[PDB]
């Protein structure tokens, strides 16, 4: 009542990474550096099309009042049952070979179902993911590569099979399985604060 704030504008495109068509694959997760805007997270919260919203940073009610340096939005597709692997700490296959979170990750992990859009009549063999690697992954590091993997013994000089397995494997999304085996589209919103001035945070409400 005592204070006034300027007219709202410049709502940066969260839809461009949410309502978009394709989310690439987990082994090549994109990275959108959203900055210089005023993102109204409320709509991303108050919606019935989002399944899991288990945040790990700040309470998802004041997030529209904390201004950070910039917010990184990652996006990819995963098996249904693995939606709980993105959480910090928990290990598995995609956790330590395709995507990992740091110990003190301070963002949020949106996920939702897309079985009606990412599976053709007989299923799509288009979404790849990693299943082998030399060792685990440090937080937030892509691993785009194709070099052949060796598990038992002997090298793999541009060969395949018998301890030269192809590092990437397809999912095989058949639109006739249970939820656990259906394609979930997942987005990770990681806030970042830095000595540089902040420029991204929710709108300041207005009144007469």
């Amino acid at each position, epitope marked *: 009542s005592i204070v006034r704030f300027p007219n709202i504008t410049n709502l940066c495109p969260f839809g461009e990474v949410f309502n978009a068509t394709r989310f690439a694959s987990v082994y090549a997760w994109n990275r959108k550096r959203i900055s210089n805007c005023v993102a109204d997270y409320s709509v991303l919260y108050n919606s019935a099309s989002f399944s899991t919203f288990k945040c790990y940073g700040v309470s998802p009610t004041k997030l529209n009042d904390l201004c950070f340096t910039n917010v990184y939005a990652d996006s990819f597709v995963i098996r249904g049952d693995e939606v709980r692997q993105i959480a910090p700490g928990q290990t598995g296959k995609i956790a330590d070979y395709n995507y990992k979170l740091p110990d003190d990750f301070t963002g949020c992990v949106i996920a939702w179902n897309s079985n009606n859009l990412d599976s053709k009549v007989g299923g799509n063999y288009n979404y790849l993911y990693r299943l082998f690697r030399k060792s685990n992954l440090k937080p937030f590091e892509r691993d785009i590569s194709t070099e052949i993997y060796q598990a*038992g013994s002997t090298p793999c000089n541009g060969v395949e099979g*018998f301890n030269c*397995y192809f590092p990437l494997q397809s999912y095989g999304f058949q639109p006739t399985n249970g939820v656990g085996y259906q394609p979930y589209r997942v987005v990770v919103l990681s806030f970042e604060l830095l000595h540089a001035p902040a420029t991204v945070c929710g709108p300041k409400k207005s009144t007469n």
Partner: antibody
Amino acid sequence: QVQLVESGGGLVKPGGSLRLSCAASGFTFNNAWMSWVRQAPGKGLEWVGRIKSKTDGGTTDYAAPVKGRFTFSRDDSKNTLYLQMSSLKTEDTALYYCTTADYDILTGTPASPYWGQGTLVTVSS
Amino acid sequence: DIQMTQSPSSLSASVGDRVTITCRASQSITNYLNWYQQKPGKAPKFLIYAASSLQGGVPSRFRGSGSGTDFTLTISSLQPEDFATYYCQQTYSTLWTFGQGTKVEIK
């Protein structure tokens, strides 16, 4: 790349001690097993024996046809395989091969790729 | 112990036919087995594992298959120089076994 060689053969009377050394050149020795096989002339190859790895003490998986005649030892220091035989026999005049054996990960079916050149054993009084 | 049968000791015919070789065993082994190739004057090499997937550098003409205790290795429109002795081999995951193959004779 990957290489394998054998040596230590000879032409001796039955009874004399004999050593066969198979040397593996430049793939790995300490993280894989190793096997020995027989290939008699004008005949199909036959099992001889394999041993385990990682200096666990050895499994001494001696083959049935040559039970209680030969012994195996993986010298990890020099990364080689030593096969010792004492009582030679005429029926044992067969080619000898050393090979790499280790089961896969996905299917888990043992097989023996990357075979050696072979060592010829001959006995004639 | 383990035993197996390798009746097809010699099977060759006009070049370009659908040659095949059988491998039968009395006991149960599942998919723990392999097939090798040996050309004259050279040590045998590694071609087929698990009776399903070939090995790198092997033309896809070779085709192994089967189940349980009976398996077969065939070839469609066999290529030149394929003539060689093909050996069958089995593993029980503890015990080992080989089998006499076929010495394809040029005719």
